[PDB]
Write a protein that binds this DNA or RNA. Structure first.
Lengths: 136, 386, 224, 63, 347
RNA sequence: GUGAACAGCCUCUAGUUGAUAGAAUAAUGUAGAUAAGGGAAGUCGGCAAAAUAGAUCCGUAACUUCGGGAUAAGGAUUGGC
RNA sequence: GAAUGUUACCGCAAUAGUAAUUGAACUUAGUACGAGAGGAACAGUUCAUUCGGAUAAUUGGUUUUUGCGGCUGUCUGAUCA
C-alpha cells in the first residue's frame, strides 16, 4: 500500500479473502502459494478484507519448494482472473490465479513470469510490467 | 460491558422523524440568497424524471486511472412540460408565519388546476374563481391597488405556477401547484416580471443558459411496513435456531428505561423525499426538438426516445432536460428542481461538456440497434410487413 | 542531454514513456514538469504531444521502429491516429495490422539495423514488421529468458548489457549485433536495464538512482 | 471507421458489457453481449446450432 | 555510513518518569462500591491488582538495551567514542546499569505475581499498591543517577559523526588557529552556527569530495592526537590517538609559513611512535603557504619527512597553497590516488 | 407397465370429494428452493445443508487367528431406434 | 380518528433530538536545512476503505405469467394438442 506503486489505483471489489489457495506459474518451480493473511483496509466490522489486483500481501509456500517453508514473503497478485470494476463497461477475466516469488524484504524477485498478466497490476506496479510477457 | 469493544452500527439510523409521504409535494425549506446585481432569475423549477441512459463522454478530468478515455457513468434526463405563469404572489420575510394579502391569480384557467382542489371532478361545476374573475370587469380597485403595495411593502416573491398535463404522457390528468422564488434588481422588478408573462411558455433565451449548476428534489419509493431486518440491517440466525432465524438482534437497553431512540425496527424504508445538489445542465431540449441523438461519430439523425419504456411514461412529447448525474427517489411524480444556493465548492465545474455517442436503444430488453430503421433495413422485405 | 529526475516516483521511465529515435512520442504524463526539462533541448520537428493506447499509460509495449516506421496493435482504437498524424510527416502506418499479443517492447528492441525477437510464436505479421524496417530479424533467446527489452538496449554506438549474463553470450553476439557488449550493474543494482532508460539519437534521459559508474557507461561507450 | 460486429454470437450491438473469457495464451472472440458469455462456458457449438450468421451463408436466402 | 547509534528514542530518567507515582496514586485511590448486592460487595479488587501488575510490567527494562551494541563487537574504536563520554565505567555501567535495572524488572515481575495472591479486601490492595510504589521508588533513585548520565550522552550522539571502517576512507586532519578560514573551508561547507564544541578552540570541520565514483571522507580530532598518550591521563587527546589508530591513509599537516616563529624541533621525534603502526597506511605531507620560506630553518626541518633522512619510507610530498587557489584540485587528487594503487589494487 | 424386486410413481376396477370459505401476499415463523469469487473466516463440537451414491467390467494397500478388511478411495461403462 | 361552518390546494418551523470519517499518491519538490550516511509542511487538481440515508438505463443474483424449447416413467387404441 505504498512500496513503489503509481498512485492509489481503483480498489476493485474482488474475491480473494483469507485462506485462499493461490497457485503458481512463473520463473519459480513452486506449485502453489497458500496465503495465511489477507487485508487491505481499516475500520470495518465483521469483514475479512480482500486483496485487489495489485496489492502487497504475505503468503506461504506449501508444495513446490520444501526448503522455503514456515516463513513470511511478499506476494503481489499478477493474475486477477475475475470481473473487475471500471467505467468503460468491459469486465473480461482469465482463469488461473496468480502466484509470484519475492524476497522477504519488501521488493520482488521473479522476472520471467509466464501466463497472461492483467494490465491493471502492470500500470500500478512497475515491477510487474517490467517482469512479464503476455498482457491480456 | 460490551461484546468485543462497542462495535460499529448496522442498526444506525438516519432519519429521526420520517413517516409516509402524505403528499406528492416535498418539503422545500431552503432558498438561495437574494442578489441585486444579477437580473431577474428563478431559484427553483419543476419537472418529471424520465429515466437513465448511457452517454459516452471524453473524460477531460485528470483521472488517476483513466483520463481522456471513453468512459460512461449514469445520467438522467428530467422531462418538463411548458410551465406557464398563472399566479403572481409576493411576500416579505419569514417571521413566525405568512404575512401578506396581495394574491394575484389569473382568468384563463384550463382543466388542470381545477382538479387539484376537488377530488371528484364530475361534481365540480367548473365555476372556480368566480368572485375573482368579476374583479376584472370593473376598473380594478382590488387588483391594481394590490400591486402598488408589493412595489414597496414587500420583498421576496413566490410565483405560483403549474405543469401542463394535456400533453404529458404521465397518466395523472392534473397540474402541480408550487412556489418559485425569483431574485433580481430591487423589489419592484419581481412582481412586474410575472405580471407581464401571462399565457407564456418557458423561455431559454433569458435565464436558462448553458452549463448551470442546479439541484434536484424528488419523491422516494416505499416498500410497506418493512422491519429492522431489511430496513436497517439485522443478521440471519442459523436453521438450528428456533422461533426465528432473521429476527431482530437482542437489544438489552436500559439507557433510560424508556427504550432508546435508535433501537428502531419496522416503519417505512422509503416513500419520503430527498435532496440532491451540484448538477450541471448538459443540453436543453424542447417538445418539437428533433435530432436529439447528436452522435459525433456516426452522424445519424435520431432522437432519444426509449425503445421499450421504463415505467409509467410515454415516448417523449415534452421539453426534456438532460442534467449531469442522477437523482434520488423514483420518478412517476412531481420533481421540484432548484438553482444554485450560493458559491458552492463544486470542484468539478471547471470541466465543460464533451458528449458524443448517445444511447437510444432498448430500455426494456437488451441494448441492440439505436434506430428502428436500421433493423428494418438489415432485415429487408420478407413475409410479414415490409 | 543526460538528465535525471523522479517522474511520478518511477525510475523505470522506459516502462511509462518511450522516447525512441524515430519520433518523440510522449504519453499522458508530462504537463509542465516534463516541458521544463526538454524546453531548450527539443521543440523542433518532434514535439511532446500526449496520447494513449488501449486505455493504458504504457507506450513502451506496443511497437519499436528504427527511424521511420511505427505500427499499431488492433486491440486499441483509432482515436489517436486521427489527429496526431498531422504533426508527423510520414512514419506511423495507418494500415490495420493484426496483433497476436499486446506488449511489443520486452520482446523486440529498436535501433536501426540490429533487432531481436524472442522465439515463442510463429511467423505471420512479424514478417511484415521486418519488411517495413528492412532489418533481417534473427530469433535468438538470451540466457533462457523471455525478456530482452529490459535486459539490453543497444544503439548505433554501444549497448548496455544486463550483468547477469554468461561470458559465452558476450562474445558470439558481438559481430552480428555490431556492439562491444559491456556488462555491468545498473540503477543501484536493479533487475532492469532497458526498462529504466531509453537511448536516443541525441539525448539520453535516465534515472537519478543510477550510480556514477553505472551512468559513466554512456559517456564512454556511446560517446556523447 | 469500422462497424462493430460480434463474433461468437454474430450480432452487432454494444461494444461493452464485455465480461469475456480469454484463451490464456492465444486471443479469444470478443463478446457482444452478456448472453454470449454463458453460451461459451458450456462449450456450445455455433456451427451446428443456429445462433450466428455464418450458418446462413451455406443456406442461401433468395426468397 | 553508520554503526549502531542514533536509533534509540528518548528515555525518561526519574524526573520525567514520575508515571509510577501517578499510577500508585490512582491505585491507593480506588474506593469502589461494587453493584448488585450490598452484602457481596467484597468481590472486585483482584482485577484491580492484576491490572497494576501488567502495568509496571511492560514498563521498561528492554528499551534501554536497544540502541547499544556489545562490549566486544568488532573494533574497539566503536566503543572508544563512549570512553570520552561515559567511560568504560558508565560503559559497563552502560550495559552495566543496563542489566542492572534489567534484572530489576526481574524482582519486579517477581513480587508482582507474588502478592498476586487473594481477591478480597480492596483495602489490603491499597497497602499492596503502596508497597509496590515504595519498591519502585527504591531503584530509579540511584537509577536516574547514572540514568541521568544516560539521557545526557543520549542526546549527545547528534553532533558526533560516525564513519565506516568497512570501506575506503581518507584521513584528513589539520591544525586550527593558523588560517583555515580560507584553506580548509575550501573543501567542505562546515561552519559553526548553533552546535557548540569544546576541547579545542574551533569545532568539527570535516572535509569531503566526490571524484569519479569513489568515496573519501574522515573527521579530525585536533589536540589529543598532537601529543603522546602518557601526557594525557585520559581526556580525548587519547581521543585523538584512537582516532588515528582507526584509518587507511593518514595525512599529516605542516606549515612553513612562520606565523609567529612556531617551527618544529621537539615534535620531530614523535612520528616514530606511530610509524610501525602504519603497516598498510599511506602517508602524505601538505605544507600551506610555500613562498615566504626563509633560509633559516629550511636547512634543518627538511630532514624530517621532506627528504630521505629519517623515519621516511620514500613517498611523494607536495609544496603549494590552496589559500591562493593554486591547483587546489591537483593537491586534493594527489593525496588519495596512492590508496587506489595499494589496498584497492591488491584487494 | 417400468424395474433386480413384492418399494415409490402412473393407469384400470372397487371404495371417494366431511376436516370452515372468500378477498388480500408488508415485516417477523415450521418443513421444503436456488446464488459468481473464496472452499472451513461462524460454532464448545464434522451440529445443519449440499455433493459423492445402483448394476456390469477393471483396479483394490497396510494389519490379523485367513470365516475378514472388500460393494475401498481415485476411473470407465449406462437411454431410445 | 373525535375537531370548535366544512373539505381540498398552497406557506412560516418553536421545542426536543442530531450524522460522515480517515489515509495514501501526483504537482510545487530528488525542495528549505545539513560535514557525510538522509529527509517535511501550506495552496490547487485527481482517489480508495468503513457506516447511514437512496437509485434499477447497464452488470450480477432471484424466476407463479408454474412462459418457450427439450427429455424420462405411465395413460386417453395411436399421432397432433
Amino acid at each position: 500500500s505504498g512500496n513503489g506503486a503509481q498512485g492509489t489505483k481503483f480498489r476493485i471489489s474482488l474475491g480473494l479473502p483469507v485462506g485462499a489457495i493461490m497457485n503458481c506459474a512463473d520463473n519459480s518451480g513452486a506449485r502453489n502459494l497458500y496465503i495465511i493473511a489477507v487485508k487491505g483496509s481499516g475500520s470495518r466490522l465483521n469483514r475479512l478484507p480482500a486483496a485487489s489486483l495489485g496489492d502487497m500481501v504475505m503468503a506461504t509456500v506449501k508444495k513446490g519448494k520444501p526448503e522455503l517453508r514456515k516463513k513470511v514473503m511478499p506476494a503481489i497478485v499478477v493474475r486477477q482472473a475475475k470481473s473487475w470494476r471500471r467505467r468503460d463497461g468491459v469486465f473480461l477475466y482469465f482463469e488461473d490465479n496468480a502466484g509470484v516469488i519475492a524476497n522477504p524484504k519488501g521488493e520482488m524477485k521473479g522476472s520471467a513470469i509466464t501466463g497472461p498478466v492483467g494490465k491493471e497490476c502492470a500500470d500500478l506496479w512497475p515491477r510487474v510490467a517490467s517482469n512479464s510477457g503476455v498482457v491480456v | 460491558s460490551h461484546r468485543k469493544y462497542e462495535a460499529p452500527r448496522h442498526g444506525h439510523l438516519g432519519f429521526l422523524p420520517r413517516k409516509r409521504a402524505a403528499s406528492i409535494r416535498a418539503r422545500v425549506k431552503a432558498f438561495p440568497k437574494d442578489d441585486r446585481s444579477k437580473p431577474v432569475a428563478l431559484t427553483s423549477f419543476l419537472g418529471y424524471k424520465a429515466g437513465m441512459t448511457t452517454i459516452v463522454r471524453d473524460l477531460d478530468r485528470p483521472g488517476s486511472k483513466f483520463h481522456k478515455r471513453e468512459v460512461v457513468e449514469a445520467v438522467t434526463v428530467v422531462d418538463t412540460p411548458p410551465v406557464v405563469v398563472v399566479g403572481v404572489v409576493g411576500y416579505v420575510e419569514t417571521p413566525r408565519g405568512l404575512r401578506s394579502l396581495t394574491t394575484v391569480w389569473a382568468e384563463h384557467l384550463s382543466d388542470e388546476v381545477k382538479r387539484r382542489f376537488y377530488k371528484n371532478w364530475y361534481k365540480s361545476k367548473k365555476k372556480a374563481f368566480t368572485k375573482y374573475s368579476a374583479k376584472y370587469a370593473q376598473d380594478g380597485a382590488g387588483i391594481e391597488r394590490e400591486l402598488a403595495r408589493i412595489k414597496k411593502y414587500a420583498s421576496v416573491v413566490r410565483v405560483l405556477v403549474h405543469t401542463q398535463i394535456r400533453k404529458t404522457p404521465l397518466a395523472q390528468k392534473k397540474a402541480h401547484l408550487a412556489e418559485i422564488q425569483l431574485n433580481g434588481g430591487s423589489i419592484s422588478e419581481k412582481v412586474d416580471w410575472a405580471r407581464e408573462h401571462f399565457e407564456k411558455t418557458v423561455a431559454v433565451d433569458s435565464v436558462f443558459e448553458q452549463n448551470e449548476m442546479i439541484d434536484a428534489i424528488a419523491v422516494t419509493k416505499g416498500h410497506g411496513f418493512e422491519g429492522v431486518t431489511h430496513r436497517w440491517g439485522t443478521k440471519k440466525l442459523p436453521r438450528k435456531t428456533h422461533r426465528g432465524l432473521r429476527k431482530v438482534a437482542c437489544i438489552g437497553a436500559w439507557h433510560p428505561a424508556h427504550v432508546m431512540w435508535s433501537v428502531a425496527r419496522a416503519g417505512q424504508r422509503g416513500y419520503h423525499s430527498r435532496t440532491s445538489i451540484n448538477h450541471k445542465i448538459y443540453r436543453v431540449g424542447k417538445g418539437d426538438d428533433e435530432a436529439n441523438g447528436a452522435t459525433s461519430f456516426d452522424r445519424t439523425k435520431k432522437t432519444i426516445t426509449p425503445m421499450g419504456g421504463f415505467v409509467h411514461y410515454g415516448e417523449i412529447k415534452n421539453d426534456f432536460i438532460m442534467v449531469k448525474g442522477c437523482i434520488p427517489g423514483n420518478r412517476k411524480r412531481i420533481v421540484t428542481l432548484r438553482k444554485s444556493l450560493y458559491t458552492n465548492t463544486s470542484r468539478k465545474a471547471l470541466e465543460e461538456v464533451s458528449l458524443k455517442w448517445i444511447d437510444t436503444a432498448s430500455k426494456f430488453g437488451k441494448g441492440r440497434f439505436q434506430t428502428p430503421a436500421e433493423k428494418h433495413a438489415f432485415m429487408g422485405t420478407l413475409k410479414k410487413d415490409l | 542531454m543526460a538528465t535525471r529526475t523522479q517522474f511520478e516516483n518511477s525510475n523505470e521511465i522506459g516502462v511509462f514513456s518511450k522516447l525512441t529515435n524515430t519520433y518523440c512520442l510522449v504519453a499522458v504524463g508530462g504537463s509542465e514538469n516534463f516541458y521544463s526539462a526538454f524546453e531548450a533541448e527539443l521543440g523542433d520537428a518532434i514535439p511532446i504531444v500526449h496520447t494513449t493506447i488501449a486505455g493504458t499509460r504504457i507506450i513502451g509495449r506496443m511497437t519499436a521502429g528504427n527511424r521511420r516506421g511505427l505500427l499499431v496493435p488492433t486491440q486499441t482504437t483509432d482515436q489517436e491516429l486521427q489527429h496526431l498524424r498531422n504533426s508527423l510527416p510520414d512514419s506511423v502506418k495507418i494500415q490495420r495490422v493484426e496483433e497476436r499479443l499486446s506488449a511489443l517492447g520486452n520482446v523486440i528492441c529498436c535501433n536501426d539495423y540490429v533487432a531481436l525477437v524472442h522465439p515463442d510464436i510463429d511467423r505471420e505479421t512479424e514478417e511484415l514488421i521486418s519488411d517495413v524496417l528492412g532489418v533481417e530479424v534473427f530469433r535468438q533467446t538470451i540466457s533462457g529468458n523471455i525478456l530482452v527489452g529490459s535486459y539490453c538496449s543497444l544503439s548505433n554506438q554501444g549497448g548496455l548489457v544486463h550483468p547477469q549474463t554468461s561470458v559465452q553470450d558476450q562474445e558470439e553476439l558481438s559481430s552480428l549485433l555490431q556492439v562491444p557488449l559491456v556488462a555491468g550493474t545498473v540503477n543501484r543494482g536493479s533487475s532492469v536495464v532497458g526498462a529504466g532508460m531509453v537511448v536516443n539519437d541525441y539525448l539520453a534521459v535516465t534515472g537519478l538512482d543510477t550510480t556514477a559508474p553505472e551512468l559513466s557507461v554512456i559517456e564512454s561507450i556511446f560517446r556523447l | 471507421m469500422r462497424i462493430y460486429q460480434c463474433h461468437f454470437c454474430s450480432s452487432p450491438c454494444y461494444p461493452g458489457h464485455g465480461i469475456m473469457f480469454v484463451r490464456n495464451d492465444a486471443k479469444e472472440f470478443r463478446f457482444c453481449r452478456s448472453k454470449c458469455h454463458k453460451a461459451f462456458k458450456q462449450r456450445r457449438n455455433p456451427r451446428k446450432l443456429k445462433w450466428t450468421k455464418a450458418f446462413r451463408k451455406a443456406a442461401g436466402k433468395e426468397l | 555510513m553508520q554503526l549502531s547509534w542514533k536509533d534509540i528514542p528518548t528515555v525518561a530518567p526519574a524526573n520525567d518518569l514520575l508515571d509510577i507515582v501517578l499510577n500508585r496514586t490512582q491505585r491507593k485511590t480506588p474506593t469502589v462500591i461494587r453493584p448488585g448486592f450490598k452484602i457481596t460487595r467484597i468481590r472486585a479488587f483482584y482485577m484491580r491488582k492484576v491490572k497494576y501488575t501488567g502495568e509496571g510490567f511492560v514498563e521498561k527494562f528492554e528499551d534501554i538495551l536497544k540502541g547499544f551494541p556489545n562490549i566486544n563487537d568488532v573494533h574497539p574504536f566503536h566503543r572508544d567514542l563512549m570512553d570520552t563520554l561515559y567511560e568504560k565505567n558508565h560503559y559497563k555501567i552502560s550495559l552495566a546499569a543496563i542489566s542492572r535495572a534489567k534484572s530489576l524488572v526481574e524482582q519486579v515481575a517477581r513480587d508482582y505475581v507474588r502478592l498476586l495472591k487473594f481477591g478480597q479486601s480492596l483495602f489490603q490492595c491499597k497497602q499492596l499498591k503502596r508497597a509496590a510504589l515504595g519498591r519502585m521508588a527504591t531503584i530509579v533513585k540511584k537509577l536516574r543517577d547514572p540514568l541521568a548520565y544516560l539521557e545526557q550522552v543520549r542526546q549527545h550522539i547528534g553532533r558526533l559523526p560516525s564513519i565506516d571502517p568497512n570501506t575506503r576512507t581518507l584521513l584528513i586532519c589539520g591544525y586550527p588557529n593558523v588560517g583555515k578560514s580560507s584553506f580548509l573551508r575550501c573543501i567542505t561547507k562546515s561552519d559553526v552556527d548553533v552546535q557548540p564544541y569544546a576541547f579545542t578552540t574551533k569545532s568539527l570541520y570535516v572535509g569531503h569530495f566526490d571524484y569519479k565514483y569513489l568515496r573519501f571522507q574522515a573527521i579530525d580530532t585536533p589536540g589529543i592526537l598532537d601529543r603522546p598518550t602518557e601526557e594525557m591521563n585520559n581526556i580525548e587527546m587519547q581521543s585523538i590517538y584512537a582516532i588515528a589508530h582507526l584509518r587507511s591513509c593518514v595525512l599529516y599537516f605542516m606549515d612553513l609559513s612562520e606565523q609567529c616563529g612556531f617551527t618544529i624541533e621537539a615534535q620531530v621525534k614523535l612520528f616514530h611512535s606511530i610509524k610501525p603502526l602504519f603497516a598498510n597506511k599511506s602517508v602524505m605531507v601538505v605544507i600551506n603557504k610555500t613562498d615566504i620560506i626563509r633560509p633559516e630553518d629550511l636547512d634543518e626541518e627538511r630532514a624530517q619527512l621532506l627528504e630521505s633522512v629519517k623515519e621516511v619510507p620514500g613517498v611523494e610530498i607536495m609544496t603549494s597553497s590552496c589559500q591562493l587557489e593554486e591547483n587546489v584540485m591537483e593537491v586534493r587528487n594527489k593525496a588519495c590516488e596512492k590508496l587506489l594503487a595499494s589496498r584497492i589494487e591488491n584487494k
